[PDB]
């Protein structure tokens, strides 16, 4: 009876379950994509989705693009600095969402460089005709196996530009979704602090 009630009511209990870090088979990447697409669908008003690319309107520049899978893409014996999971552009702002890999010796190759960020911004300007003046990229780092409540609220704040009350109204369970960063990993806490405290690289 209780599981029947759970499935009936909590339509994204799977997203909550994967966000909490319970899923050891695939992690939370797919559920994160589904959550982000869900918010994109409720933030836009004419949304067309495809395999790896979801777009809203042609004027608002509301695009989600799941580039690849960082965990499998990252080989441990190669030297490349740019490997990102999702790329979301909202109006004139661009964000790169990367799930920090559990390997501290690969997190550094996972975080893209400043000049690569500049190139991404320049390509975005070329393709979508947005002037170089108001193109600005934010790099976003996330925990490897779960999400923090702070992480989710920040993801909503910068990727979708919706406040805390707006977020809790839009999704009921975020209000009491209580998760903290595991203190056993200080490397991720510091790296995420730095990356999220960075400013918008604007060119």
């Amino acid at each position: 009876e209780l599981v029947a009630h759970i499935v009936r009511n909590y339509s994204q209990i799977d997203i909550i379950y994967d966000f909490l870090g319970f899923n050891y088979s695939e992690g939370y990447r797919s559920s994160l994509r589904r959550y982000m697409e869900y918010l994109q669908c409720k933030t836009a008003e004419n949304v067309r989705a495809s395999g790896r690319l979801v777009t809203g309107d042609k004027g608002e520049h509301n695009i989600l693009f799941d580039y690849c899978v960082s965990r499998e893409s990252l080989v441990s014996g190669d030297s490349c600095q740019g490997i990102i999971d999702f790329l979301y552009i909202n109006g004139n702002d661009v964000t790169l969402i990367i799930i920090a890999s559990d390997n501290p010796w690969l997190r550094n190759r996972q975080l893209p460089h400043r000049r690569q960020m500049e190139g991404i911004a320049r390509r975005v300007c070329f393709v979508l005709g947005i002037p170089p003046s108001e193109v600005r990229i934010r790099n976003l780092l996330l925990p490897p196996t779960y999400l923090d409540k702070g992480s989710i609220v920040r993801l909503n704040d910068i990727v979708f530009r919706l406040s805390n009350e707006q977020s809790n109204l839009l999704i009921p369970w975020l209000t009491n979704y209580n998760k903290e960063l595991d203190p056993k990993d200080v490397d991720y806490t510091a790296l995420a602090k730095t990356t999220n405290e960075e400013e918008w690289l604007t060119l």
Binding site: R8, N9, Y10, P172, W173
Partner: peptide, 29 residues
Amino acid sequence: RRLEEAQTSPRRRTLEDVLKRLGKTTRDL
């Protein structure tokens, strides 16, 4: 309460639709 109340209150599969989903017409065949 919000979840409970939000749970309470709230084509043709022919040949042509398949062909047009695929982006081809019978004439081009």
